[PDB]
């Protein structure tokens, strides 16, 4: 699945007077009387998986719309269904945490643009001239995608303290006794000079068949003309993988895990790109 | 010399509202003396982004400076230790940050705030000018009396041999060191755990594998403070036989190195300053 982390808020144009959309409260209040929102020829549904994670599905197949309306019992317990059965439509997955979200979509699952329309059509309260915004903060990438990147700048290599290479790096700096119980992790922030492309080193570390990292964040351009964008990558890709026997609740655990790993980066991104949100 | 890296802004609304003081513009617009009681403060440019900031209460020295009217070139080549302009501090300016280094009798960052204010920096209602420490310089000596060391960042300029050693460990077998500025090893302990052993082992390596280190730490017991430590020292060393211009070169060179680290302690400790 393609995955990313986003800010959410509603605001005047040019991001003036950003305010929280209370996304968890909003969505949780919709569940008791749960119906699709139709948008053009598309039908969109939200269903809870657990406290922080929702299943966001989409279809334009009227016979699937029919089956969902008549399968009221299959509709209410989905936490332990296979994600790839697509009984509720093409799936995307939404992890909610205050003014930030995590979001993962299958090939045909709904988009954050769809999610914006869902929130409008479901009755997001909005002043005149106020609109809902879902702002990308970081994008999840894979190893083959990294190999096609046009430009790579600052690359940050995160090493959990349990990795052997963690003790290697401290030792070469002069550490004689590393008590792993004291440490969470270390980061190697590899900073280019000027706007120089360090994609050869960055690619060499990321494609190492003996990966010496737990996670990697890098600033990159996919193509010429793209904006410098923060990407993240897990050694255990997990969320990149195909669905295959995974259950909706297992994806929601993967996402809470991913958000915990990245939370420090997320809020860093949040405060620079977005600024403050009330509340 | 006592020295540090600071953020500068105009602050109001419980400190929530922070506005740029545009310090380079303001200083370059200045009339070199302010008398504050029986003291006199003096700013003159040295070179580029560094200004000389001095203090005296000898009235006769003040009238001599005023008539002499020392040229930019005269001040650059002056012995820094000579105090023919008063007891010196040094002020490097870039955007909303400063490097600031004072001699034991040089003016302080309150003196500097005094000087900007008495020279007509404009304030709004309930607004104050603030120079906020981001990173205080320290020495290997001082680290020795430190009994708690938290998160710790090892800066490695790309010229050091351990830069390529580290990259190869991670699997990089084709390093064009000219592409690179440096790397940082950010060492993160578990919640509030004390990692002074690994930290001191690195800092006190008789064959240092670093260019600079910054760390969160408390000197004695009961006090987290962001410190930084430079291979060489230079600024931390006393004002001997060096010139104001040489200090300025050091100021600039030190700032250029730490730039990354200052700009992050910025966004963490102060956040956003509207410009």
Author numbering:
A (entry chain B): 1 to 279
B (entry chain A): 1 to 30, 34 to 226, 228 to 279
Task: Kindly provide excerpts from the paper associated with this entry.
RexA and RexB function as an exclusion system that prevents bacteriophage T4rII mutants from growing on Escherichia coli λ phage lysogens. Recent data established that RexA is a non-specific DNA binding protein that can act independently of RexB to bias the λ bistable switch toward the lytic state, preventing conversion back to lysogeny. The rex genes are situated directly adjacent the cI repressor gene in the λ genome and are transcribed from the same PRM maintenance promoter that drives constitutive expression of the repressor during lysogeny. Here, we have shown by X-ray crystallography that the λ RexA protein has a split, two-domain architecture that shares structural homology with RdgC.
The resulting structure, however, was incomplete and was thus used as a search model for molecular replacement to solve crystal form 2, which refined to 2.05-Å resolution with an Rwork/Rfree of 20.6%/25.1%. Each monomer contains a split globular domain (residues 1–139 and 248–279) comprised of a seven-stranded antiparallel β-sheet flanked by α-helices that is divided by a dimerization domain consisting of a four-stranded antiparallel β-sheet with four α-helices localized on one face (residues 143–234). These domains are connected via two flexible linkers that we term the hinge loop and the swivel loop (235–247). This helix kinks at residues 261–263 and interacts with strand β11 of its affiliated dimerization domain, anchored by a salt bridge between D215 and R261. A bound sulfate and two cadmium ions from the crystallization solution provide further hydrogen bonding contacts in this region in monomer A. The sandwiching of a cadmium ion between two monomers at the two-fold symmetry axis produced a significant change in packing relative to crystal form 1, which ultimately yielded the high-resolution diffraction. Based on this modeling, we predict RexA undergoes a major conformational change that reorients the globular domains to facilitate DNA binding.
